[PDB]
Amino acid sequence: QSLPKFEIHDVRDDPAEGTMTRVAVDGKLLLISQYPQLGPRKVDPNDLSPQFDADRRISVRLRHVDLAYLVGVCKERVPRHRMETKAYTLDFEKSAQGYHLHGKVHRVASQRMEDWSVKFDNHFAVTLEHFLESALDESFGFRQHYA
Amino acid sequence: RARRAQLPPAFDVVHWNDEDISRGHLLRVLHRDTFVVLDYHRQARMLTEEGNKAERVVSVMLPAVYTARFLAVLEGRSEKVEVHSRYTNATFTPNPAAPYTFTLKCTSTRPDETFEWTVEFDVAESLMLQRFLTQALHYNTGFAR
RNA sequence: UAAAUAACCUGUA
RNA sequence: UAGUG
Prior knowledge:
The complex is a heterodimer of chains A (147) and B (145). With 147 residues, chain A is an alpha+beta fold. Chain A is built from 3 helices and 8 strands; from the N terminus they run E-E-E-E-H-E-E-E-E-H-H. Chain A has one domain (1-147): Transcriptional Co-activator pc4, Chain A. In chain A, strand 2 and strand 3 form a beta hairpin. In chain A, helix 1 (64-75) crosses helix 2. The radius of gyration of chain A is 16 Å and the shape is globular. The two termini of chain A are 21 Å apart. With 145 residues, chain B is of the alpha+beta class. Chain B has one domain: Transcriptional Co-activator pc4, Chain A (Roll), CATH 2.30.31.40. Chain B is built from 3 helices and 8 strands. In chain B, strands 1-2-3-4 form a 4-stranded antiparallel sheet, with helices on one face. Chain B has a 4-stranded antiparallel sheet with strand order 5-6-7-8. In chain B, helix 2 runs antiparallel to helix 3 (123-140). Chain B is globular. Chain A binds chain B through residues 26-28, 64-65, 68-69, 71-72, 75, 77-78, 81, 136-137, 139-146, and chain B through 1, 4-14, 31, 100, 123-125, 127-128, 131-132, 134-136, 138-139, 144. Chain A binds 2 RNA strands through strand 2 and strand 3.
């Protein structure tokens, strides 16, 4: 919102295949989310309409102990982490080209568990590693407490 | 978040068991004024009902000097650390089972009954603490100034 | 351009 | 053994 985060804006010419994946974290909670692409690619820098669909959006709030497990994987401390809750069933494994987060998640205003899978490769795996190793260290409230 | 600001940086290692409340505990690992403080909480009621799930049992206050020692273990250098006070006799060591995991076994008294307990640390909960401590020591040495 | 259906409060000694 | 915003 005015949180630590990084988004990957993948917009295609085929509106059905573009997405905006956002990874941000509030304190000890990581929020992984993805909205689909709403129709065509905007082309007017002045056009302030929605480019991604906030209604078919995928949102998943993870636990604090999870954020930890995720780093594990990045550090090979755990081959693959599998979390399970009411709204989704995901896995996060290391790949020779990056990371893979997948499972069956579910969009807002839905109850239709759909097969899902997002990937972080090359220069994006990097980006993601730094965000995670950082979320954790700052997830304890030391910086704010001493400020 | 107005409250989590002015409060003890801390991180809880959770192990509830509504199935068999004979293994229900919640440790808050906090750092209060150069104090790595452990609060082993016990489960007195289930997740499914309303109320205060956890109930605080014994509070082990750890002195600043310990961080480096505990870390010396979490980092694979020492094979164990010992704590001691008129109220506790606890131990943290590498759990032989799986690598990167650790066990904390504290045998506390209470005013003479020995309350003992034991909290395991999975490869992630270990990494959890591992960072929590590095941070403190970090600020303790006063780098944040 | 978020996310969304309420309750893991501390000190004191 | 004990008590409170």
